[PDB]
């Protein structure tokens, strides 16, 4: 993390947080690629992901990071789902953030809570993402190669 921060925050050359590697992958794509569905793996990827977004929104608020497609046309989410990286896809689905600039980042917002009771709200990109891909569509007709479909 500290070096992620120093890369993006330093005086000498701040990292371009949205750059794409040879395959079209950004840091969010690479993180999805580096997941291996073990509990401690999810945990670290999940919050480093979180961290990147918090830094995106702090430093460069205009940038819609999630939406950036790798060579194959995949958002980070859609990659996650194409490669059976379930813990992480689930985390993205369940994302909720509350701080200044929080709303743009968050996946889930909760609105009605009664002394008992709770309500959860979901965005939701996967269901309605006709233009490129749907989370359901990627999951619904998976390769069957993938370790976790």
């Amino acid at each position: 993390l500290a070096i992620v921060k120093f890369l993006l925050q330093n005086s000498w050359q701040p990292a371009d947080i949205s750059a794409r590697d040879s395959v079209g992958n950004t840091v969010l794509h690479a993180l999805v690629e580096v997941a291996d569905n073990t509990v401690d793996n999810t945990k670290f990827v999940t919050s480093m992901y979180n961290e990147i977004l918090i830094l995106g929104a702090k430093l460069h608020p205009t940038l819609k990071l999630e939406e950036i497609t790798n060579r194959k046309g995949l958002t980070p989410l859609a990659l996650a789902a194409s490669s059976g990286k379930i813990g992480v896809l689930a985390y993205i689905l369940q994302r909720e953030i509350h701080e200044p600039e929080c709303r743009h980042l968050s996946r889930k917002f909760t609105e009605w809570a009664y002394g008992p009771v709770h309500s959860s709200l979901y965005d939701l990109s996967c269901i309605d993402t006709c233009e490129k891909n749907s989370v359901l569509e990627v999951i619904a007709y998976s390769s069957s190669e993938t370790p976790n479909r």
């Binding site: 009664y114 002394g115 008992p116 009771v117």
Partner: protein
């Protein structure tokens, strides 16, 4: 002068100053804090109730001032006991809310300025989910206070 909107905004931000000139206004016009015009025409919400929703740190002294004003005109009892009338929150009083919020201090205060302890909150918000929902304890402050383990 004061319209419904003026006070409701004051309450929203816990402003006890914009309500300095309050008491003397409905002394001249002899208007009551409880008049038809000082409630939302479809829910029956009053400023005290707006105050009950607009809590910051379980606190609002617009309440203390609002009550104080109601006794000086002795709107006092029917003011502290006004209920919602929309199908959703029907029959909900300020005391219901204080409990819903687990706020001894405000329960205490409302009971002392004469909140009706037997008032039944019976709207769809206080019965089993449509799902609406939700949620039933039924109705009466005691019942609430128990069902929420308080």
């Amino acid at each position: 002068l004061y319209d419904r909107r003026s006070i409701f905004d004051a309450v929203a931000q816990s402003n006890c100053q914009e309500l300095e000139s309050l008491l003397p206004f409905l002394q001249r016009s002899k208007k009551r804090l409880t008049d038809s015009e000082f409630k939302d025409p479809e829910t029956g919400k009053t400023c005290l109730l707006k105050a009950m929703l607009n809590l910051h740190n379980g606190q609002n002294d617009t309440i203390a001032l609002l009550l104080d004003v109601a006794r000086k005109t002795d709107s006092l009892k029917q003011f502290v006991n006004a209920s919602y009338t929309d199908s959703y929150y029907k029959g909900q009083t300020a005391l219901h809310i204080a409990i819903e919020r687990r706020n001894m201090t405000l329960v205490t205060l409302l009971v002392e300025n004469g909140a009706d302890v037997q008032a039944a909150a019976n709207g769809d918000f206080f019965k089993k989910t449509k799902g609406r929902p939700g949620f039933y304890f039924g109705e009466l402050p005691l019942s609430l206070a128990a069902c929420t383990n308080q």
